[PDB]
From a paper:
Three unique chains form a parallel α-helical right-handed bundle.
All five constructs were screened for crystallization, but only three of them yielded crystals of sufficient quality, crystal structures for 111, 211 and 121 were independently solved using the MAD phasing from selenomethionine derivatives (thereafter designated as 111sm, 211sm and 121sm) to 2.25 Å, 2.10 Å and 1.6 Å, respectively. An overall superimposition of 121nat and 121sm (r.m.s.d. of 0.35 Å) confirmed the identity of the two structures. The most deviated pair is the first trimer (chains A, B, C in the asymmetric unit) of 121sm versus the second trimer (chains D, E, F) of 111sm (r.m.s.d. of 3.01 Å). Namely, a triple helical chain linked to chain B of the [name] domain is always in the leading position, the one linked to A is in the middle, and the third one linked to C is in the trailing position. This way, construct 121 (or α1Aα2Bα1 C) translates into staggering order of α2α1α1, whereas 211 translates into α1α2α1.
Author numbering:
A (entry chain C): 1 to 72
B (entry chain A): 1 to 64
C (entry chain B): 1 to 71
The structure:
Amino acid sequence: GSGPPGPPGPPGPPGARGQAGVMGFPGPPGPPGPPGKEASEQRIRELCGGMISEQIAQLAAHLRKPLAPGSI
Amino acid sequence: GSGPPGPPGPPGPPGARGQAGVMGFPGPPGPPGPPGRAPTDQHIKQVCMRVIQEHFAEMAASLK
Amino acid sequence: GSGPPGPPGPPGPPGARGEPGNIGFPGPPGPPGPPGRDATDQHIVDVALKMLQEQLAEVAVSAKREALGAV
């Protein structure tokens, strides 16, 4: 082999890309919802005023002290 | 003296594997829960009815 | 004259290091929070009792003013 060694070979291929990053963690639960909205005093008065009047009148009659006559 | 150079060498080996990628960001918080329940008109009436019925003795005292 | 060609050359250098891995995907959202608490009956009871006290008290006022002729 009187002649010199041949030229070096070409560079090898670049290495493989690294392992992909894993998916992030799940987020936390959200906060509890708002508390239920309370009925207004006015709506309660609308819905219950009549029954209170009726039951007061019926009880007055039971006790033999019936009242001022009520609205027709 | 010499003779011709030899043939070219083989390709080098592959490069080293890259570093692992970063983890993704965490997900966002979930939404707020649903609102609590508000009273229905029928429910309001029923509570009122119960209150009246549990106070007949007190009513009677003021109607005697 | 010439001797024979030389031996093959040396292997080439290793390749460049690989690039870093791809970025991870974002995580899922969390679940919705728990429901808010329902409105309790207390506020309704409180107003019903106020109304009862009011109307009962008016029965006495009514009787008094009837006797006075000043309703």
